[PDB]
Design a protein around this ligand. Structure first.
Ligand SMILES: [Zn+2]
Length: 256
């Protein structure tokens, strides 16, 4: 599977039947229908001990991996029960600035969408957590083109060394706090991973406030390849999945 014309999101239902499940993601967020739920606690992000380790091109995106052998970079509160550890973050972007994000707000598409993935510690490891309705907590942040994001530059500068699928590079001492927006107001709903196996084990937390990156910054995301060092060059762009039916789910907002 992939995002191409012949193995794209439209073909996934064949290998992964859950593609047509009840709590698939992403979805379009209707700001006027989402309900304000006063009982939501504020989000608690603790990334001061976060230990980044590696960045790799897995042929679908590039992941920054963190040491999740301990409670050093966690997410808590909000609609979450328990502690979730940060294991990795990656992005989804388009071939053009008018698209790229997975989630949409009132049908508006952003240039890209950042995903910070955490798993519920009560389940021992990531592998067991993705098998639970409440095993993962993904923090979604939209990116719009404008002013450059200083804290993201360390990432774009190394993209040259993991151009092709399979490549990885040491990536230590990266502070994920630099990617967060000023505010933490969010929308939340139960969903799934946006790429196969597409398991419905995620509690989505989408931040209302997007962050700004420069045209030159997102531009370097597009110079990556889906192919391995051998195959013909296939630029890595539009690796996002289209909105899925909300079905019988409700989107909660932590603000009004
Ligand atoms: Zn993602």
């Amino acid at each position: 599977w992939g995002h191409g014309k012949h193995n794209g999101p439209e073909h996934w239902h064949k290998d992964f039947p859950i593609a047509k499940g009840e709590r698939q993601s992403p979805v379009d967020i209707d700001t006027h229908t989402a309900k304000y739920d006063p009982s939501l606690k504020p989000l608690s992000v603790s990334y001061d001990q976060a230990t980044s380790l590696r960045i790799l091109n897995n042929g679908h995106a590039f992941n920054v991996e963190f040491d999740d052998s301990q409670d050093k970079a966690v997410l808590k509160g909000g609609p979450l029960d328990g502690t979730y550890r940060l294991i990795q973050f990656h992005f989804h972007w388009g071939s053009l600035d008018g698209q790229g994000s997975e989630h949409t707000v009132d049908k508006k598409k952003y240039a890209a969408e950042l995903h910070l993935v955490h798993w519920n510690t009560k389940y021992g490891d990531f592998g067991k957590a993705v098998q639970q309705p409440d095993g993962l907590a993904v923090l979604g942040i939209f990116l719009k083109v404008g002013s450059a994001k200083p804290g993201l530059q360390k990432v774009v500068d190394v993209l040259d060394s993991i151009k092709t699928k399979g490549k990885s590079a040491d990536f230590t001492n990266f502070d994920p706090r630099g990617l967060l927006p000023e505010s933490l107001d969010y929308w939340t709903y139960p969903g799934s991973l946006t790429t196969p196996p597409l398991l419905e084990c995620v509690t989505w937390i989408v931040l209302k406030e997007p962050i700004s990156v420069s045209s030159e910054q997102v531009l370097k995301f597009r110079k990556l390849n889906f192919n391995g060092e051998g195959e013909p060059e296939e630029l890595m762009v539009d690796n996002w999945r289209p909105a899925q039916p909300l079905k019988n789910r409700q989107i909660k907002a932590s603000f009004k």
